[PDB]
Ligand binder design. Structure first.
Ligand SMILES: *[C@H](CC(=O)O)C[C@@H](O)/C=C/C(C)=C\[C@H](C)C/C(C)=C/C=C/[C@@H](O)[C@H]1C[C@@H](O)[C@H](C)[C@H](/C=C/C)O1
Ligand SMILES: Nc1nc2c(ncn2[C@@H]2O[C@H](COP(=O)(O)OP(=O)(O)NP(=O)(O)O)[C@@H](O)[C@H]2O)c(=O)[nH]1
Ligand SMILES: [Cl-]
Ligand SMILES: [Cl-]
Ligand SMILES: [Cl-]
Ligand SMILES: [Mg+2]
Lengths: 1017, 200, 131
């Protein structure tokens, strides 16, 4: 098309055409915009495109064209600057400086082309980073002088200085070498006195809001690093906290400066510096009260109105007040005359804390936690804040977010429904609120009870009744469990439960009953101490929970199950013993009525119920009694199981129907549930079903294969085959669950393992990829983890069955078979950790695949895989090293040392594996340290490839210099040699070593990096 | 038509394109095809104050596909900065994206979004996410996969841009609808629906 | 003495015959894959003036329409190979995005029961539209 013309550099650049393409991209749409975008990207990425920059700057009538022109220069400046001849550098500098001057002089442009001037200034800063001060010593003085001569230029100088401070102090860590960063920070430090002098003068002269605002913006940056004396030994605190607070244009930025000042490094023993720290706060709070709003103002309302910049201002006020008070409030606590100020500051925070804005609330809550935690320990402080704390109790109680346990919510129709999902993001908020509220309760338990009991009274009588009001209250009441005395709690919980029971009678309809039910369940589950002490109450609660297991409201039902297990986890002892005036332990009563009790529950709820019973049963430590309870608990599933192990043993095809497959799955799921809570105690039940279970695993496996053969791979998607695989998966989960908690490892090895391996391994190996269950690998990891040391031949067998066939599934790309990928490297890790001999038994060809597999893991972006890959590599090296000077260790190094070194370097330097840096560096340090310490007994080089007797150290350096030279040909030999010298000398100090690697990663991105940077220390 | 330029930035693989596609068509794209430079998509929402149109500039997060980079931000009226709560490096880089963005766009409403909260093994803890406070950015936990808070960034931005805190999304009106194939249906029947183990 | 005091979804003329939560997919023919189009309440709406029954489905939170078409007498609910809780069927005139367009839809539900109940109702609506 016509637009492609600009890509032909053999002809002169048509600036008009460039402007057309640019405005087509920025102001057009559809296919024309898409085409223009590609053209511009290609234009920009053309390595000679920068030579067109001056031409574009001079002759273009489009600001975006000139912007793109500057991006092209920026890329040149930051990457290839030292490649240029010296006159081109002078030239580029001159027309950048000249353009800035020119655009500042012309008022019209200065006003309307702010994007372009800011971009021009950043580009200037890039030149400074390369050239300043060494080849430009007069930049700052000439900048300072030029300021006096024009208000537009002075203002823009402040922008340039802001950006320079940013680039040097705030964003240099990743982008420069340690040595260059130090150089530029020192350079700014040495000339700062003059920079500040101009800054102070402008602030004092106080002419032009936009110049003042720009000056304060630069100051905000300077405050990240400048010495405190510039702030405390000049009049600058007075100006910030009075003058600049009064004007709204300068108020935003001044508050942020004052927040940063509150963080400066400051002597703790100087009475005067303390007085100055008090005064600026006092000034600032006075200007807010007189110029912005009084302490009584409704900040909730103001924020919600969202006029102008009010929300951002209130946000910044919160940040200032919380930052200052966290550090300095002690300065205000002892002087009687400073008390009004202390409390006014906190009263503003109380008002800020009422704003409806989650993230702001978190900021304030962080502060309250800091306060109350301090009042909990610091002697004689809490009385000061008694009125503040009392108001805080109200704010927190009235803004309690729904706890994870409460499973009901309100929908748009005004109906109380079960939630669709978990409110994942309010979990942390609840914890924080609870923490503060617990502290406040300890600080004044009388005040808290009174507030809650009377709030509750106003729910009953109806004066303040609402779902919102009863919920927040109920959540708050549950959240302070543990704060009161057992006796106060006794009376408290009694009163609260009486009231909530009264509330349930009063408020009818499914919605009101769901709300009140949820709240009572949350409270009772939160006070197990009370439940332990009050059996009749406990029993009645549990029976009440069982009634809810029959509710048609599914939310209430599900919470009944969760509350049941929550109670049981804490109170199980009281279910297992026979209570006074009861004919039997309540566990006996529960098991007996289990069919009736669980009859309306969904299966996963039935499994939770069973899991709870398992918790109780494991309280019984007499083995005879425990096993009997286990057997009684499992009666229904064992009976269903027994009848299926006959029917399906008669008709291997009867597994065809959905209903039987669902039944079987639920039977095994029930076993998993009970095994989860009983752990080692589950064994006898595992023994009842084990062999038939493994036979079932084989039968189901045959069915899956039969179906895939008859229907194709698509069969694996069908409900039928998915149901059969579910059975195999649950069987594997059950065995995993048991072995992971087993205490008798001898029985695991002598009874469980051989039949397990027989049932699962060949089946995995001989199914097509799409039919292999990644869960097999997961089960095997637990087997190796727990008994691998006892089953060396079994480990060999596991490897043989899964290693090559899984590797071939996952080594074509990074995405196919994600679960297998993850479980595969988990299994290799534990085998390498626990049964390294298994790898020694592999033939050389398969061992090579192992090494391939490890390095393949290095190259994953997926963290699960990547991390294990690095760990395996490190553990492997340690395993070899442990063998000492024997032929396998020798051949290992000869074959694979340099493969690991080069592969580790590749992921270190490719810019796509940055999350792995720490472990990559550790691995590389280990590898280099092996040679540096002469822990490799044989030469790493071929005979005659280098002179005889040549040390491995000398050869390593030679190999690496060659490797880097070819991998990074734009580096000089001196850069490489210096890098390697440092890196190799620093191979005992991970912190310094990592620094040197990071410096290398900076230098590979540019040309002409200084090799002396690697001497940094 | 009232339309606003929204630029969307963040590290490669954080879920920018997937988030936008979800809003555009309703789909969840499982594959990672890196964006090359920028993709521009119109995206309309119906509100109680009329239709608001975002022209979404979904930019490339991978450095090698960055294209014009900050050149994309010119004249943006709002922004979303995206990171991945399962990847800490992506949160570490938020200040860098914010820096490059506000240098070109000095006073615009910006939402910070932590994506992929559907994933069990979360790495960037809730408690750690504080960068937004001093920079006045709105923050949300989101998931483009589970649709957790997926609408919140646009609801907030629309409130800020229209200047009405009480703005709500409203149901678009439903026009009465009007009144070989056998090959096409059979291929559809025999292609399995994805994610058969989800709730819906 | 009188004291002066201080000073369209397009579904108002429709009866809701059936409502269920669903996830709706459309078949991309080119790439052979189902892509999600929306999750929310699928409703059967009978117009009071014409007695015609349509499917209207809106996405949660955004409320954007992902399905809007007459329940044509000719359509046929068909099983997907991967699911016992979905139906696939061909639609020749859905107007959710705007202009009248043909799609192959798949619609999945919370349970098989919900799927079966949907089909029962789909067929009932078809008999209404026949009258
Ligand atoms: C609705 C009730 C209604 O009126 O219909 C709510 C109800 O369905 C839910 C009840 C739940 C989940 C728990 C209750 C707390 C269980 C009950 C009713 C326990 C009753 C216990 C009484 O013995 C109780 C009465 C009070 O005087 C106090 C609590 C004493 C406690 C002495 C230690 O005993
Ligand atoms: N689990 C999960 N995965 C997600 C989510 N959002 C996106 N993804 C996945 O993350 C991968 C990358 O998504 P993509 O939208 O391409 O990210 P991007 O930020 O646009 N990458 P780029 O900047 O290179 O264009 C895809 O595989 C996608 O399915 C999410 O919320 N949860
Ligand atoms: Cl511009
Ligand atoms: Cl106990
Ligand atoms: Cl050299
Ligand atoms: Mg993308």
């Amino acid at each position: 098309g016509a637009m492609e013309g600009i890509l032909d550099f053999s002809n002169d650049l048509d600036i008009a055409l460039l402007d057309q393409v640019v405005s087509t991209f920025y102001q057009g749409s559809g296919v024309q915009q898409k085409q223009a975008q590609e053209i511009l990207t290609k234009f920009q990425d053309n390595p000679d495109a920068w030579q067109k920059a001056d031409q574009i700057l001079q002759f273009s009538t489009n600001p975006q064209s000139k912007f793109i022109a500057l991006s092209i220069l920026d890329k040149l400046i930051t990457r290839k600057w030292k490649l240029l001849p010296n006159d081109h550098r002078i030239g580029i500098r001159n027309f950048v400086v000249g353009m800035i001057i020119s655009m500042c002089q012309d008022d019209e442009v200065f006003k309307t082309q702010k994007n372009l001037i800011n971009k021009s200034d950043l580009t200037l800063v890039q030149i400074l980073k390369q050239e300043w001060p060494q080849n430009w010593p007069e930049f700052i003085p000439e900048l300072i002088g030029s300021s006096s001569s024009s208000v537009n230029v002075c203002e823009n100088n402040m922008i340039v200085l802001k950006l320079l401070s940013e680039e040097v102090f705030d964003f240099s860590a990743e982008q420069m070498t340690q040595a260059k960063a130090l150089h530029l920070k020192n350079s700014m430090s040495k000339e700062f006195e003059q920079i500040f002098k101009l800054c102070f003068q402008v602030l004092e002269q106080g002419s032009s809001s936009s110049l003042i605002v720009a000056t304060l913006e630069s100051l905000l940056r300077y405050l990240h690093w400048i010495p405190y004396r510039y702030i405390y030994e000049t009049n600058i605190l007075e100006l910030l906290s009075t003058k600049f607070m009064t004007s709204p244009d300068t108020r935003a930025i001044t508050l942020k400066c004052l927040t940063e000042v509150s963080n400066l490094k400051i002597p703790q023993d100087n009475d005067l510096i303390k007085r100055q720290t008090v005064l600026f706060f006092q000034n600032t709070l006075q200007q807010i009260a007189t110029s912005v709003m009084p302490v009584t103002a409704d900040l909730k309302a103001t924020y919600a109105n969202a006029n102008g910049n009010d929300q951002s201002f209130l946000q910044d006020l919160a940040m200032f007040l919380t930052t200052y008070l966290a550090r300095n409030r002690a300065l205000l606590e002892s002087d009687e005359s400073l008390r009004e100020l202390l409390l006014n500051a906190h009263q503003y925070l109380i008002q800020l804390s009422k704003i409806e804005e989650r993230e702001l609330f978190k900021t304030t809550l962080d502060y309250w936690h800091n306060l109350v935690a301090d009042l909990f320990y610091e002697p004689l402080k809490k009385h000061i804040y008694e009125e503040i704390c009392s108001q805080l109790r109200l704010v927190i109680i009235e803004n309690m977010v729904r706890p994870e346990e409460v499973l009901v919510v309100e929908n748009d129709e005004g109906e109380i429904v079960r939630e669709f999902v978990k409110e994942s993001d309010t979990i942390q908020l609840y914890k924080s609120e609870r923490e503060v509220l617990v502290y406040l309760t300890h600080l004044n338990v009388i005040d808290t009870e009174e507030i809650m009991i009377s709030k509750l009274a106003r729910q009953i009588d109806g004066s303040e009744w609402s779902w919102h009001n009863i919920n927040t209250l109920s959540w708050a009441i549950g959240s302070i469990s543990g704060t009161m005395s057992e006796d106060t709690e006794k009376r408290f919980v009694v009163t609260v439960i009486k009231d909530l029971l009264d509330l349930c009678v009063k408020k009818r309809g499914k919605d009101n009953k769901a709300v009140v039910a949820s709240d009572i369940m949350y409270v009772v589950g939160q006070y197990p101490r009370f439940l332990k002490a009050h059996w009749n109450f406990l029993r009645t609660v549990i029976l009440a929970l069982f009634e809810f297991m029959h509710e048609t409201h599914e939310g209430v039902q599900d919470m009944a199950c969760d509350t049941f297990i929550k109670i049981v986890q804490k109170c199980k002892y009281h279910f297992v013993i026979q209570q006074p005036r009861e004919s039997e332990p309540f566990i006996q009563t529960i098991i007996r009525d289990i069919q009736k009790t669980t009859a309306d529950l969904q299966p996963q709820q039935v499994h939770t119920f069973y899991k709870a019973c398992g918790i109780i049963i494991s309280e019984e430590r007499s083995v005879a009694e425990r096993n009997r309870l286990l057997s009684d608990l499992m009666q229904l599933p064992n009976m269903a199981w027994d009848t299926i192990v006959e029917q399906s043993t008669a008709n291997p095809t009867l597994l065809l129907d959905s209903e039987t497959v669902k039944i079987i799955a639920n039977i095994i799921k029930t076993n998993v549930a009970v095994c989860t809570s009983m752990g080692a105690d589950f064994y006898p039940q595992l023994g009842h079903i084990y062999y038939n279970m493994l036979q079932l695993y084989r039968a189901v496996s045959s069915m899956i294969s039969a179906q895939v053969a008859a229907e194709g791979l698509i069969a694996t998607k069908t409900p039928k085959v998915r149901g059969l695989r579910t059975i195999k998966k649950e069987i594997l989960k059950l065995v995993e669950t048991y072995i992971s908690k087993a205490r008798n490892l001898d029985d695991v090895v002598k009874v469980l393992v051989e039949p397990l391996l027989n049932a699962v391994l060949e089946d995995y190996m001989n199914n097509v990829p799409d039919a292999r269950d990644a869960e097999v690998l997961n089960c095997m990891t637990t087997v190796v983890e727990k008994v691998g040391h006892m089953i060396p031949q079994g480990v060999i067998l596991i490897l043989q069955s899964v290693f090559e066939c899984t590797l071939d599934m996952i080594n074509k790309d990074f995405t196919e078979y994600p679960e297998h990928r993850v479980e595969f490297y988990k299994l290799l890790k534990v085998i390498n950790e626990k049964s390294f001999a298994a790898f020694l038994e592999l033939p050389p060809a398969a061992f090579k695949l192992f090494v391939d597999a490890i390095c393949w893991a290095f190259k994953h972006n997926n963290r699960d895989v990547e991390v294990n890959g690095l760990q395996i590599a490190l553990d492997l090296v340690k395993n070899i090293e442990r063998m000492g000077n024997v032929p396998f260790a020798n051949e290992f190094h000869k074959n694979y040392f340099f493969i690991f070194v080069s592969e580790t370097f590749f992921v270190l330097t490719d810019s796509d594996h940055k999350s792995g840096f720490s472990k990559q560096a550790l691995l590389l340090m280990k590898l280099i340290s092996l040679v540096y310490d002469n822990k490799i007994s044989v030469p790493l080089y071929q005979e005659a490839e280098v002179p005889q007797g040549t040390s491995n150290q000398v050869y390593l350096s030679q190999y690496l210099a060659n490797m880097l030279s070819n991998a990074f040909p734009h580096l000089t030999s001196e850069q490489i040699a210096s890098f390697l010298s440092a890196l190799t000398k620093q191979c005992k100090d991970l912190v310094v070593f990592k620094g040197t690697l990071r410096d290398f990663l900076v230098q590979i991105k540019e040309v002409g990096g200084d090799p002396t940077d690697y001497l940094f220390a | 038509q009232v339309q606003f330029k929204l630029v969307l930035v963040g590290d490669g693989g954080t879920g920018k394109t997937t988030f936008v596609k979800r809003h555009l068509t309703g789909e969840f794209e499982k594959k990672y095809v890196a964006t090359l430079g920028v993709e521009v998509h119109p995206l309309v929402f119906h509100t109680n104050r009329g239709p608001i149109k975002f022209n979404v500039w979904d930019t490339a997060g991978q450095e090698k596909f960055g294209g014009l980079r900050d050149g994309y931000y010119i004249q943006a009226q709002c922004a979303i900065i995206m990171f991945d709560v399962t990847s800490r490096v992506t949160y570490k880089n938020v200040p860098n994206w914010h820096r490059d963005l506000v240098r070109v766009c000095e006073n615009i409403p910006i939402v910070l979004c932590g994506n992929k909260v559907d994933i069990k093994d979360r790495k960037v803890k809730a408690k750690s996410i504080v960068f937004h406070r001093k920079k006045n950015l709105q923050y949300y936990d989101i998931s483009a996969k589970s649709n957790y808070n997926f609408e919140k960034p646009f609801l907030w931005l629309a409130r800020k841009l229209i200047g009405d805190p009480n703005l709500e999304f409203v149901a678009m009106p439903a026009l009465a609808p009007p009144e070989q194939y056998e090959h096409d249906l059979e291929v559809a029947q025999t292609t399995a629906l994805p994610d058969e183990d989800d709730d819906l | 003495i009188h004291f002066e005091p201080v000073v369209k979804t397009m579904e108002e003329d429709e009866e809701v015959l059936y409502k269920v939560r669903a996830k709706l997919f459309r078949f991309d023919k080119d790439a052979k894959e189902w892509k999600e189009r929306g999750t929310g309440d699928c409703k059967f709406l009978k117009n009071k003036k014409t007695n015609k029954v349509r499917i209207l489905m809106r996405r949660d939170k955004t409320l954007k329409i992902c399905a809007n078409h007459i329940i044509a007498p000719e359509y046929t609910l068909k099983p997907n190979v991967g699911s016992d809780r979905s139906w696939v069927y061909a639609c020749t005139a859905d107007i959710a995005e705007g202009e009248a367009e043909a799609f192959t839809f798949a619609i999945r539900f919370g349970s098989k029961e919900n799927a079966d109940k949907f089909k029962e109702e789909f067929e009932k609506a078809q008999e209404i539209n026949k009258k």
